[PDB]
Amino acid sequence: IESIIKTATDTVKSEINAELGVVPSLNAVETGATSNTEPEEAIQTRTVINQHGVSETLVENFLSRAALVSKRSFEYKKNFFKWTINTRSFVQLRRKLELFTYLRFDAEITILTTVAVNYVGLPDLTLQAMFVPTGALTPEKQDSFHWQSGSNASVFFKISDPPARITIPFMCINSAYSVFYDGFAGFEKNGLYGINPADTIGNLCVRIVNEHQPVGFTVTVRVYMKPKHIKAWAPRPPRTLPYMSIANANYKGKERAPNALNAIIGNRDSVKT
Amino acid sequence: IESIIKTATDTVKSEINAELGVVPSLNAVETGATSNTEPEEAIQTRTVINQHGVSETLVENFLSRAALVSKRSFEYKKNFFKWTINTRSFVQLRRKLELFTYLRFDAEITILTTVAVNYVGLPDLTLQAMFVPTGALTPEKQDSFHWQSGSNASVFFKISDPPARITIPFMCINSAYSVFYDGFAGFEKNGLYGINPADTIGNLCVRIVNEHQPVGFTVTVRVYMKPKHIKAWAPRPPRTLPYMSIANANYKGKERAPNALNAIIGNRDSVKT
Amino acid sequence: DRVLQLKLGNSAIVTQEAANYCCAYGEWPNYLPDHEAVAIDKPTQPETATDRFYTLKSVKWETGSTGWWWKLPDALNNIGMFGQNVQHHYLYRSGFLIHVQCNATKFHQGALLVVAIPEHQRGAHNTNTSPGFDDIMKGEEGGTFNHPYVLDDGTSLACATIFPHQWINLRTNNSATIVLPWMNAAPMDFPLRHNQWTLAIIPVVPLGTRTTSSMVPITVSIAPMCCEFNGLRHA
Amino acid sequence: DRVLQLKLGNSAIVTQEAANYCCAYGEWPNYLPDHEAVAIDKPTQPETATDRFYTLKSVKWETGSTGWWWKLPDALNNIGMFGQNVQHHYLYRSGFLIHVQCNATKFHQGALLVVAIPEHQRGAHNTNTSPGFDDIMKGEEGGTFNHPYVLDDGTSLACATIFPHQWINLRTNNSATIVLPWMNAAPMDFPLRHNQWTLAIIPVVPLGTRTTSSMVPITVSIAPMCCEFNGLRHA
Amino acid sequence: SMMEINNTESAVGMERLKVDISALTDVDQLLFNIPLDIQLDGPLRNTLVGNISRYYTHWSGSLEMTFMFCGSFMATGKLILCYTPPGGSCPTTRETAMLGTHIVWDFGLQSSVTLIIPWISGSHYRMFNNDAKSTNANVGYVTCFMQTNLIVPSESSDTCSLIGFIAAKDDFSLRLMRDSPDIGQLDHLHAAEAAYQ
Amino acid sequence: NQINFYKDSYAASASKQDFSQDPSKFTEPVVEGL
Amino acid sequence: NQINFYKDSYAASASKQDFSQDPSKFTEPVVEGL
Structure with missing residues (x-):
């Protein structure tokens, strides 16, 4: 027992x-x-x-590491950054979450940024990351009026400083996150397979506050995530064939014997080798 | 007693x-x-x-100092840094470890870096040091996919900041490190003399995160190591003749009387001088 | 104090003029305790036919001689019931006993340093290539030192008294006896690739007389005590 | 009652359909007591690598087959660490365990008498010359009975149930297991000249079916238990 | 969790999981062998003890292998399943392979056996090294022979099958987590830029 | 010695003190004991 | 006054309080006392 x-x-x-x-x-x-x-x-x-x-080999030691979830570079001369939140973008964090069915954790997000003006040096810059939930209106321009909101959670940081860190609690409306979902999303006859509306978090919008000057920039943003306080249920077999997209779980297979479709383990000469 | x-x-x-x-x-x-x-x-x-x-004159006072273990400079215009870990590269740390046979300690590693752009000034840069163990796949390019790993231990630091420090525990599979090994490594008839596979730690890969800009660089990396919590067994005589390589303990000797092959102590005129 | 007799198994060695026998680092060999064991098979402890004195081949000592060495797990891998348990099993754990015998008359002189070195990683002279499976692993016969003044690895001979050792001074005694415990980082070890100790005798003061020209050989006996084996195989 | 599992050393044998195993004359093997010992050296008791199941070579059973035999100290004189202790030592003392395996389908028939005979002094047919070192002393392979009806020495087969034995009836079981103690007039014995027991299996009812023609082999395992050796030699 | 013993070519799909045994005419014959290499590309890479323990680099414990016979009810026979410690090369005949840790199994009413691979090592741990013949990485050889023959009547099928399982015991241990060598492609996947309007 | 001056409880560090374990739900899932 | 807030025990400082010493293993290794 x-x-x-x-x-x-x-x-x-x-x-x-x-x-x-x-x-x-x-x-x-x-x-x-x-x-x-x-x-x-x-x-x-x-x-x-x-x-x-x-x-x-604990679950809270196997999972709680800082893994990259997003990386996107925008030029400054759509002038900002917008990302609908998912954890299916990079295949090395993903495969470690595909081992379980349900999860319950508290993330811890680090925004790390670097710039490359295209006088090759640079003065100080100031950023802004804003967490827009679902339903709220997202901006569509650098100087839109949606950035003056006191209600959305924002954070200002500089390039010269240590990177920004916050923490975000368990946000779902159920008691765990569903990594897998064998159902539809709408009440209509034709919806979208494999997604639930109980797991949709929202957007994360990042701009740069300084007015465009004489010189154009190139800003590259990385976002890391470390889970905390992890509970996990129902272990599953690991994914073997490579991934193909994000919205589903299709499979293609490599052409030759390691991780092919008709062969996972590479061939041997004979059984009595 | x-x-x-x-x-x-x-x-x-x-x-x-x-x-x-x-x-x-x-x-x-x-x-x-x-x-x-x-x-x-x-x-x-x-x-x-x-x-x-x-x-x-304690053993923990005789040993625990910060000594240089690595120094290598790479130009940025193989674009990164890779070093299979040994303590036989610099001859002043080495000779103090050759006094003992077995050792058991916890290191404390400091990565110190400086740059020299070849506008002679420079903007801010960001580094990345990743500790790849044995068996794991090492990257071969600056922007390889092996840098997105959440599982390997990584650390980010800047040029403008104080240098990075971590600590690494006792990693061997035995109960002490074998400074000397009078045996072979493989089960085959012809292996490599003088090395054990119980002491192989892995690689340490260092890159620079910023995209190549208009101007080329020159980055110089130094790595220091300070032992902690030292236990030592079986003292040995010190090395007298100079070293010749890393994979073994060959000896050549200087040409003239101090530290020559047929004379360690320089000559005197007569015994009744 | 001079007279002494050892007995192990069905063997015995009797001497009259010998200085005391030393224990390496104050230790005595013993079996493996329960709180340090790792492998879970029952070990084979034969306790007789592997605890005897096995003598090696004698070497002749001359005026131009320059030293000899041996490797202690390797010198006994084809001798008796020690050499048969080693080939069939995968791990071992033991401790040895060395006894060196060299005698002469009242008119000879000379001195031998009988030293026992753990993990004696050798080195080749004036090259970059490491030594191979040849020039090491000589069973039951030992190599001769090329440059004994630096112990053939660069470290000086003048500090070789830090290892457990005795002296054979032909003025005083004619025997030397050393007891060695198990010394390794691991509790057991594969015997066909790794060698723990390295016996080495070095004539510091060369011999000399004016009576006659006669042979003077040197003989070495080794007795593995408290040995135990594990992991049975085929050959 | 049918299912059974033996384990000795690092070996184990698992069977599901087998009648009970018999002890020869109500005895179980043990070591030598103090009030019966004669030789005064300490015996070598290895207790592992000599207490395992060693399987012999299988023989094919056909319709014209007529029986097989083995000699139990002699069949193991070149197998494993039992065969190495025998060649170096002069005396031994042990007891064995036999296990015979032969299976078929539901449609076959047949019966084997698996008997163990002490001091089975053989005899040649229709001559006066005694048999020599040839035609006896076949290691790891056994001779075939020429006249099994009289056990190749004149005594009848119909009274061979006086020795410890079992039956392998293919209708009922497919295994037979016999435990043998030390049985000799002397406390120890020289193993290279004298053989105590003689395993012998004899097909009384020959096999037969109408399904197909397929091979049916018979396999024998021997496990020496409570063995000890004495009197160390060179080869 | 089962394992691909029959990983030879021209074995398409899920026929790679079982091995075929049949009747034969000689006295003793070899059937198969398993290379105990988790790190290399072997039969053990795709199991549960294989995929989970490639994230770590030191391992220490015992293993067990469980074989299920999937013949008919009228079929009999015996096998022998031996394990040899890593000192020498692989055994060829039954005369040099009975000397390891073996089990002898009869095909009975209940159709599984278990071969414990004990933890025989000098050190406390072993490494997942890339060299197969290293002293701290080489584990041993598991191989199977025929004790007696495989005998069937005329109505049953001649070719029977075996399914091989593997798991760990309750003293298994792992250390020093690293990155998995399995996922190594860098292929860009569809609908990645759809989150980036 | 853990340390937090934040008013929210989810802001704390991780914890590695949960050594409870029930392995006999995956290995012995049957009803009738063997 | 040493100080560490890390959860691991190998992260601490060094210690110089180990004054135990047995010199008569290198200088007097013999069995029979003189």
Whole structure:
């Protein structure tokens, strides 16, 4: 049953056995169960005290790293940055979230920015990141009136400073995020497969505050995300074939034996090699 | 036996001796032992209280200094930096580790960087150091996809800031690092002498994040290492002849009497000089 | 204090004139405790036919001689029931006992430094190529030092008393006896690729007399004690 | 009662349909007590790498087949670490465990008598010359009975149930398992000249079916338990 | 979780998961062998113990392998499943392969067996190294022989099958998380710029 | 020694003190015990 | 007064409080005392 495990288990001394009516090594996997043959009952062992800690394979250690979610470069001479939030854009963060079905965490977002004026040096600049939820009106110009909003959460930072960090709580209307969704989105007969409306967060708009001067720029924005306080349910098998798009889970397969469609593991000469 | 020594020892008053059957000054070094003639038994002494502390010759004071392990300069107009980790590159850190056989410590690594654009001034730059373990795939280009990894430990820093510092724990699979290894590495008949696979750490890849602009650069990287929490076993004699390579312990010797092959100590005119 | 007798198994060695025997770093060999074991098979502890004195081949000491060495796990890999347990098993753990014998008359002189070196990573002279499987791994016979003054790796001989050692001074004694424990970073080790210790005897003061010209050989005995093996294989 | 699992050393044998295993004369193997020992050296008791199941070569069972035999100290004199302790030592003392495996379908028939005979002094037919070192002492392969009806020595087969034995009836089971103790007049014995036991399997009812013509092999495993050796030699 | 023993070419699809055994005419014959290399491209890369433990670089514990026989009810036979420690080369005949850790299995009412691969090592851990013949990375060889024959009647199919499972025990351990060597393509995917209006 | 002066509870650090574990839901999911 | 707010124990400073010493393993390695 439920028990607190701090380190790995240990082995106790084994004697010879010639018992009738008892077979440890036989079982039946047709029941759906997993084998329970202790090594004490298959070979002759000694007694070994074990000090190996298992604290690194936790779920909160396996997940909580800073991974890139967005990268986009805009020139300044649509003059700003707008990104509808998803976690399906980069394939190395994605495959680690595809192991579970439900997730419940608190993110921690870092906006890192660098510039390259195209006098090759540069004066100081000032940025603005604004978190527009769903429903609210998004700007469409650098100096739109939607940037004067006191209600949307904004943050100002400079190029010369350490990067900006905030934290965002658990935002869903259910009790967990659905990584997978086997349903439709609308009440009509023809909607969009594979998305739920219970997981849509909104936009994130980034501009640069300084007025265009004599010289044009090139601004490159990176956004990182680190989960915190993670709870996870229902593990799943990992994705093997490469991804093809974002809105679904299509598959194409590579042409030659490693990760092909009819072969995941590359070929061998014969079985008795 | 084992005892706690804080300061050096003291001397007690001596009288005249004409004892028969007792000789302090005679011994036999054929037993492999060391002499134990107290100065109280060889000359006539006075009583001297001694306050000289011995706390500076500790092993953790003899070793734990910041020593240079790497220095390499790359031009930016293979566009980045890659170094398979060893401590045999610079001969002044090396000779202090060659005194012991086994070591167990926790390092503390400082990456110090400076640049020289070849407008002679410069704007702000941003770096990235990534610690690739053994087995993992190393990048081969500045903008490769291996830099988006959330799993490898990375760190971002600027030129204008204080340098970066991290710490790295004891990483070996044994209980100590083997400075020397009198064996081979593989199960085949012909492997590589003098290296063990239990001590191989991996790569350390450093790039610069900013896109190439109008002007080319020249970046110079230095890496320092300070051991901490040192335990040391089995002292050895020091290296006298100069080093010749990294993968082994060959010796060549200088041409003339100081540190030559047939003479370590320089010559004298006669024995009765 | 001079007279001494060792016995291990069905072997025994008797000497009359010998200085005391030293233990390397104050230790004595023993078995592996429960809180340090890793492999979970029961070890094979034979405790007889692997705890004997195995003598090597004697070497002749002359005036132009310059030193000899041996590798202690490797010198016994084809001798007796130690060499048969090593080939069938995958891991071992043991400690040794060395005994060096060299005698002469009242009119000879000379001195030998009998030293035991852990992890003696050798080096070749005046080249960049590392030594291979040849020029190391000589079973039951040992190489001769090319440059014994620098121990054939660059470190000086004048500080080689930091290792466990004794002296054979022909004026005083004719025997030297050293006890070595298990010394490695790991609890067990593969015996056919890695060698822990390295016995090496070096004539500092060369011999000399005016009586006659006669042979004077040097003989080495090794006794592995408290050995145990694990991981059974085929060959 | 049918299902059974043995384990000795790093070996294990699993069967589902087998009648009970018998102990020869109610005994179980053990070490040598103090009040019965004669030789005064400490014995070598390895207790692992000599207490395993060593399988022999399988023989094919056909309609004209007539029986097979083996000699139990002699069949293991070049197998593993049992065959290496035997060649270096002069005396031994052990007890064995036999396990015979032969299976077929629901449509086959047949029966095997698996018997174990102490001191089976053979005899040649229709001559006066005794058999020599040839025609006995076949290692790891066994001779075929020429006249199995009289056990190739004159005594009848119809009273061979007085020895410890089991049956392999293909209607009922497919396995037979016998445990044998040390049985000799002396406490130890020289293993390269004298053989205590003699395993022998004899097809009484020959097999037969009308489905197809397919091979049916028979396999024998032997496990020496509680073995100990004495009197170390060179080869 | 099952594994691709039959990863040879001209085996399309999910026929790569089982191995075919059949009757034969010689006394003893080899059936298959498994290279125990998680890091390299082997049969163990696509399992649950394979995909999860490639994110880490040190591993320590025991393993187990479970074989299910999928023949008919009228079919009998025996097998032997041995494991050899990594000192030498792969065993060829049954005479040099019985000396390792083996199990001998009879095809009975219940149709699974379990072969424990014990943790035999000098050090405390092992590494996922790129060299197969390193001393801290080479694990051993698992191989299977025929004890007796595979015997079927005239009405059953001659070719029976085996399915191979693998999992870990309760003392398995992992350390020093890294990046996975599996995903290595850099292909640009559709509808990426749709979020970037 | 953790430290936060923020009024919200989700602003804190992570925690690695959750060593509870029930492995016998994936390995032994059956009803009747063997 | 040492100070660390990191959760890992290897992140701390050094320590110079280890004055234990056994010199008679290198200088007197023999068995029979003189």
